[PDB]
Amino acid sequence: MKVKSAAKKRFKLTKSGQIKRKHAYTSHLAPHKTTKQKRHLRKQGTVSASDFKRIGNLI
Template sequence: MPKMKTHKGAAKRFKKTGTGKFKREHAYTSHMFSHKSNKQKRNLDQSAIATTTLANKLKKLINN
């Protein structure tokens, strides 16, 4: 059976941490900042951890 290929779209969006969790970036960070509060912009700039259900799917897409 051939090897599974890495899903490149997922690999660019998610990075695996040392503990095996998947780090992701927030959405809504590219434009239209004038109506967003400073608190919202500051919080969107931080990375987040993917949920457990999404992480289980990502393990199949990202094989590393």
């Protein structure tokens, strides 16, 4: 099996197996979002349980 080249470059793993990710809606059209929204989307997150199984076998 080959690791998907798109699964990597977008999902980093951690010590306990959580898969770190970046928030979307952070590429352009900035004035259409509030500074609260922008500063909340700047921080990184982890995949939800509904996607953890699908990303585990993808990596």
